[PDB]
Amino acid sequence: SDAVTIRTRKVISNPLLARKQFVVDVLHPNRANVSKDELREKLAEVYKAEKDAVSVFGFRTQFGGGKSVGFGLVYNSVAEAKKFEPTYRLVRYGLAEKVEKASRQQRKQKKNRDKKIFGTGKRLAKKVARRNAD
Amino acid sequence: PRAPRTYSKTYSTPKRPYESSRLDAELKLAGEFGLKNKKEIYRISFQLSKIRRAARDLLTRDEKDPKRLFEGNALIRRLVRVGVLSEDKKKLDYVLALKVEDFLERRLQTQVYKLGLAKSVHHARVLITQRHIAVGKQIVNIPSFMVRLDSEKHIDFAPTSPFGGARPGRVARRNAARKAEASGE
Amino acid sequence: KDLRSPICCILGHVDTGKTKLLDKIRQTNVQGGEAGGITQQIGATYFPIDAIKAKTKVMAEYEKQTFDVPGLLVIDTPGHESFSNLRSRGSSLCNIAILVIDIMHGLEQQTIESIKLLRDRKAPFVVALNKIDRLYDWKAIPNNSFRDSFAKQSRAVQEEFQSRYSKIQLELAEQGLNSELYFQNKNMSKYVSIVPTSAVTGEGVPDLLWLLLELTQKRMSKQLMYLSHVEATILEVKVVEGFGTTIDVILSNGYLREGDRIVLCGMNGPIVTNIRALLTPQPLRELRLKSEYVHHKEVKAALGVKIAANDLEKAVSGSRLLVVGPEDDEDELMDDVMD
RNA sequence: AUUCAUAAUAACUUUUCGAAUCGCAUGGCCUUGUGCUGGCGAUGGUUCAUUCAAAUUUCUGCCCUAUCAACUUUCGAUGGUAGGAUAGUGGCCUACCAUGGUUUCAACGGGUAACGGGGAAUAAGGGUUCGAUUCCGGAGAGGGAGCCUGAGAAACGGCUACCACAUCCAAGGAAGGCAGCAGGCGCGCAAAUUACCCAAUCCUAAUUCAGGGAGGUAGUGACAAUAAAUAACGAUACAGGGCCCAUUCGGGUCUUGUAAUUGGAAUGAGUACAAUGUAAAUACCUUAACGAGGAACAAUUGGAGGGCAAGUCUGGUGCCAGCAGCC
RNA sequence: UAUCUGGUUGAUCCUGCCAGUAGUCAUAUGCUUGUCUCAAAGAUUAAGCCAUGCAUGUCUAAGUAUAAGCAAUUUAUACAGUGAAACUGCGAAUGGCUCAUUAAAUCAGUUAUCGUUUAUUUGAUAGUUCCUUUACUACAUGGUAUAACUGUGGUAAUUCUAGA
Ligand SMILES: [Mg+2]
Ligand SMILES: [Mg+2]
Ligand SMILES: [Mg+2]
Ligand SMILES: [Mg+2]
Ligand SMILES: [Mg+2]
Ligand SMILES: [Mg+2]
Ligand SMILES: [Mg+2]
Ligand SMILES: [Mg+2]
Ligand SMILES: [Mg+2]
Ligand SMILES: [Mg+2]
Ligand SMILES: [Mg+2]
Ligand SMILES: [Mg+2]
Ligand SMILES: [Mg+2]
Ligand SMILES: [Mg+2]
Ligand SMILES: [Mg+2]
Ligand SMILES: [Mg+2]
Ligand SMILES: [Mg+2]
Ligand SMILES: [Mg+2]
Ligand SMILES: [Mg+2]
Ligand SMILES: [Mg+2]
Ligand SMILES: [Mg+2]
Ligand SMILES: [Mg+2]
Ligand SMILES: [Mg+2]
Ligand SMILES: [Mg+2]
Ligand SMILES: [Mg+2]
Ligand SMILES: [Mg+2]
Ligand SMILES: [Mg+2]
Ligand SMILES: [Mg+2]
Ligand SMILES: [Mg+2]
Ligand SMILES: [Mg+2]
Ligand SMILES: [Mg+2]
Ligand SMILES: [Mg+2]
Ligand SMILES: [Mg+2]
Ligand SMILES: [Mg+2]
Ligand SMILES: [Mg+2]
Ligand SMILES: [Mg+2]
Ligand SMILES: [Mg+2]
Ligand SMILES: [Mg+2]
Ligand SMILES: [Mg+2]
Ligand SMILES: [Mg+2]
Ligand SMILES: [Mg+2]
Ligand SMILES: [Mg+2]
Ligand SMILES: [Mg+2]
Ligand SMILES: [Mg+2]
Ligand SMILES: [Mg+2]
Ligand SMILES: [Mg+2]
Ligand SMILES: [Mg+2]
Ligand SMILES: [Mg+2]
């Protein structure tokens, strides 16, 4: 809330990935560090694009205080972002759900159990169904 | 299967363990410049030692030999830059001369005191480690910073701490709180 | 968190360093209707309560309390002679307990000390007696309720039971009890209830179980519900190969997790371990081959389990096992260990 | 440099290859047959080239050893001819023939607590010692041998046998190779988690997608290596040392500091909203709220006769107990 | 980054070695341990032994779908979406680990293939195939046998598998 100032250095228009990509130089004297949501909001309005098509990351605040250098991308449409962006980023933002699954080794275990069966298997269920008898 | 992160050391220790004269000398240095380690001297004698070697080496080469010229000049302008090498004696036989104090005199620890700003090499330390003082807007907290000469003009207290405005910081502020809470309501 | 399940150890007897009985309850189940190799712990025995439903035939009406009880969870230790290591064995062994006795003497050398220890702790126990077939003329029907069989066996046999029974009662009385047969029983905290039990061939064994759950209901009701933190005791220390050295522990309350940090007792200080693996139970049937335990990710307590941990060496019987909130715990174990 | 590339003649062959395959579009053109044509690209296919390899191969270079001097042809040792075998040269193997091959310029044999190299440690120079171990090459998968598949393996998270170990059984049988990642026993002076992820780095497949204990993440970690907190600043009580003057109290100005009262300041070690970080977490970098006076938020490990920097203090012991690399 | 010192004698000069001294990407052990970054690590002895888990599997519009699978809908009465199982193809010969063997071996630098094999990638490369040669030879496209599956079974027991 002491003005801030959001610079964007080294810019590249990258059409083969539908976006302009650049460094983000954030001065912020008297106000430690900025936030990503504020930054996407603020550059949503310089590239006439809107938030949900701007991605920002990297980021470390300079030693001693009052500056933070990061990196940003702004896409020539929200579709292009939703397809060219890392899915964890889309998660970070609000534009994608983290569909969570079983553990990594839970899954591997599942797979290795599945190896021991040849074919459909319900067939094998009806076959153990008789082992239930004799 | 990754790459070695390379490293090396930055000091060397005396071949003679107990030599009174050398201990007096060392201590006096540590006392003038406010160091804490015999190592803070060892380090500098080591830096020096390498510099001197390289110097001797180029010096056995021919005058106007390509290496001696490229590397010699580089070595010099590198020394002039920090303020270890006086502009008069900018030709490598004074670098072969040189001596440790010429290095010590250039630490941030010392420059902070030399242009007043501290009035004790110790107050100088305690200042620097405690974050106040900087070069640009860039806070430096390393007594061995080695003031770069064309940044000598740029040693001041930081935009933060007291001493450069911004606050008094909890202890004084604690006291301001004691005043307006005891005396008033 | 939990509804506690009952923890009952079976105490007493000699030259049955394991008493055959629980062992019979597993055997009855296995060759008559099952689905596979059955999960059996170690140092404690667990059964689902649904084992019990199958193993019991109604008297006509005497056990069907099955509302909110999930089945025992029977613990065992007698064998020595000594006389004894059996005593104590943690403050859980203790809890409810079965004391068996001879159908020929009702007394044994150590059974004085054993009952005596129980009285000191003043915790409930249920008299039972093992085998009744080292007895003249008998006839057996396997896993048949007592009552049915008793009526079936002749007069001489019947009286002989009565005769012995008064003797047993008599000795018990001088030791300091008042008691009677369970079905005959008048009030639980009035008189101790006696279930005659045959451990060679089933004869009344389900009924022994009927009485256990019944007694559990009586004393323990509001008593069973708990919230608690993980509360356990280290019983026994031995080595294994596949995933290494272990301690067998009994968990009375809590939920136990694999990644948990547990503080545990040493003797050259308080010691802490990362559980490497949770081992125990194991299914059944294996001639000379295949797996020998089953791994588990997490555990609901009232189970006796083997914990594998990478620094676990020394431990003692009588130590607590508790999940970590370090500092208070660290002093707590250390003071206790000195004893 | 060729009997090379390439081509010609006569034949040969249980005859190799010469597309009976798949996806998208549906269009031209008449003698109107659903005629005859026809777009983009997939997978194949023979031979040649290319690329990724491979296998042999020239020249020189290895530690100690003579209490190893002669070695090599049982049962190929060295060469010639022919064949067989090989992807192919070649004693690789077989027949026949010869009598060769190496050696004090150290052969041959022995040892090695021997994988080789890039390299490491030690800094006048010359050297000396080391290299199991992040990259290159080689070898191996308990020990030997054999072989199937295949472009490629004499493969071991492939089979087969034997040897040594060793598991399950209902005693009939069956099954196994952590010098992968963790983990356990043993060994020993000697070495960590039975955790998380494919987010990066890259690899593989029919393949943007699946898989990857490769690899990355964290845990354990005083192996090495880097930076460097445990305090900084005033006032007061004298005490000075100064200094001008000293006929003499002296202090007073500039301070040197030894102080058993003082004075306000500063900061991260921790703790902790938050945001940052990350695959998700954790830490770091940021940073609200907290967080320093001696009882802490309290540095150590050795030494003080000599070599060797620092006592001739006090108490104890009495050639004992102990010290002492050496004296 | 060219240094020495203590100890043989009564004292002396030597010869000599013992001991001191400094470093070690050099291990172990002891005591002590607050912060940042970096981060080696069951090599040495036993290429000793190994419980359990994981470490190799793989599908594009584009080889094979009557799942008695799902989806339904949006046109498809041969098929056409999606897709388990299985066939087929490819991969598992890379990676990772260890250092037991090994002393002209390996390995290094340097050569040779006019002495060979080479999946793949990339670039090229195929008008000839039938037959006593007019009553022709599926090419508008020739043959069956199998998985999965259905069903009947065996064994205490394995990624065992039999008959239909
Ligand atoms: Mg998976
Ligand atoms: Mg499958
Ligand atoms: Mg601050
Ligand atoms: Mg048409
Ligand atoms: Mg092709
Ligand atoms: Mg020949
Ligand atoms: Mg040949
Ligand atoms: Mg001869
Ligand atoms: Mg000869
Ligand atoms: Mg010689
Ligand atoms: Mg070796
Ligand atoms: Mg090596
Ligand atoms: Mg070597
Ligand atoms: Mg070795
Ligand atoms: Mg080679
Ligand atoms: Mg082995
Ligand atoms: Mg093999
Ligand atoms: Mg293996
Ligand atoms: Mg392998
Ligand atoms: Mg042998
Ligand atoms: Mg049998
Ligand atoms: Mg392992
Ligand atoms: Mg692996
Ligand atoms: Mg160690
Ligand atoms: Mg381990
Ligand atoms: Mg990846
Ligand atoms: Mg891993
Ligand atoms: Mg790995
Ligand atoms: Mg740690
Ligand atoms: Mg503070
Ligand atoms: Mg304090
Ligand atoms: Mg001391
Ligand atoms: Mg001295
Ligand atoms: Mg001498
Ligand atoms: Mg002497
Ligand atoms: Mg003499
Ligand atoms: Mg003398
Ligand atoms: Mg004399
Ligand atoms: Mg000495
Ligand atoms: Mg020496
Ligand atoms: Mg401290
Ligand atoms: Mg750092
Ligand atoms: Mg071990
Ligand atoms: Mg290793
Ligand atoms: Mg080993
Ligand atoms: Mg379908
Ligand atoms: Mg296949
Ligand atoms: Mg056929």
Q: Indicate the domain borders of chain B.
A: 17-185
Going by DSSP bridges, is the β-strand pair C303-309/C270-279 parallel, antiparallel, or unpaired? antiparallel
How far apart CA C67 and CA C216 sit, in angstroms, is 12
In the 103-122 segment of chain A, residues within 7 Å (Cβ) of strand D are 103-105, 107-108, 111
A 10 A CB-CB count for C127 gives 25
Q: How far apart are CA C262 and CA C246, in angstroms?
A: 14
Which experimental technique did the depositors report for determining this structure?
cryo-EM
Q: Is the CB of C291 under 7 A from strand E?
A: yes
B107 touches strand D (CB under 7 A): no
User: Which chain B residues are within 8 Å of A64, Cβ to Cβ?
Assistant: 131, 134, 138-140, 158, 160
Distance from the alpha carbon of residue B25 to the mean position of ligand 34, in angstroms? 34
Tell me the pairing of strands C73-76 and C2-3.
unpaired
Strand ranges inside C8-61, DSSP E: 8-11, 44-46
The token duo for C224 is: 């069973």
Nearest Cα neighbor of C116 from C139, C95, C99 is C99
Q: Which residues sit opposite A23 in a β-bridge?
A: A9, A71
Task: Tally helices (H) and strands (E) across chain B.
Answer: 8, 0
Determine how many CB atoms are found less than 10 A away from the CB of residue A118: 8
Q: Is C264 exposed, middle or buried (0-12, 13-18, 19+ CB in 10 A)?
A: buried
> With the C-alpha atoms ordered C115, C118, C123, C128, is the resulting torsion angle positive or negative?
negative
Return the H-helix or E-strand segment holding A11. strand A6-14
- Note every long-range contact of B139-146, with CB atoms under 8 Å and residues 24 or more positions apart, other chains counting: B139/A63, B139/A64, B139/A65, B140/A64, B140/B108, B142/B108, B143/B107, B143/B108, B143/B109, B144/B40, B144/B107, B144/B108, B144/B109, B145/B107, B145/B108, B145/B109, B146/B82, B146/B106, B146/B107, B146/B108
Let me know how long chain A is: 134
Handedness of CA A11, A12, A13, A14 (dihedral sign): negative
Are C77 and C11 in contact by the 8 Å Cβ rule? The answer is yes
Residue ranges of E strands in chain C = 2-3, 8-11, 44-46, 73-76, 96-99, 126-130, 179-181, 192-199, 202-203, 225-226, 231-238, 246-253, 255-257, 261-265, 270-279, 298-300, 303-309, 320-323
- CA C307 to C1' D68 (Å) is 63
Q: How far is the CA of B17 from the centre of ligand 37 (A)?
A: 29
User: In Å, how far is A107's CA from the nearest CA of chain B?
Assistant: 28
d(CA C164, CA C166): 5
Q: Are C123 and C94 in contact (CB under 8 A)?
A: yes
Give the largest Cα separation in chain B, rounded.
84
Give the Å distances, CA to CA, from B36 to B12, B31, B123, B142, C261.
Answer: 16, 9, 14, 14, 43
Q: Is the peptide bond before C78 cis (omega within 30 degrees of 0)?
A: no
Q: How far is CA A35 from CA A26, A56, B148, B172, in A?
A: 10, 10, 35, 31
What's the DSSP call for residue C143? T
Contact A65 B134 (CB under 8 A): no
Domain map (residue ranges) of chain A: 5-115
Chains within contact range of chain B (3+ C-beta pairs < 8 Å): A
Does C19 show up as a binding residue in the annotation? yes
Q: Which of residues 167-196 of C touch strand D (CB under 7 A)?
A: none
Q: How far apart are CA C303 and CA C281, in angstroms?
A: 9
Ligand 6 centroid – CA C129 distance (Å): 96
Residue B139 in contact with partner chain A when CB distance is under 8 A: yes
**The CATH number, out of the four listed (3.90.1150.10, 1.10.10.10, 1.10.3210.10, 3.30.70.3370), of the domain defined by the range A5-115:** 3.30.70.3370
C38 touches strand D (CB under 7 A): no
DSSP per-residue codes, A68-114: EEEEEEEESSHHHHHHHS-HHHHHHHTSS-----S-HHHHHHHHHHH
What is the rounded CA–CA span in Å between residue C161 and residue C109?
23
Structure tokens belonging to residue C252: 């009375």
Parallel, antiparallel, or unpaired: how do β-strands C2-3 and A67-75 relate?
unpaired
C-alpha to C-alpha distance for C188 and C124, rounded to whole angstroms? 10
Asked whether strand D has any atom less than 7 Å from the CB of A63, the reply is yes
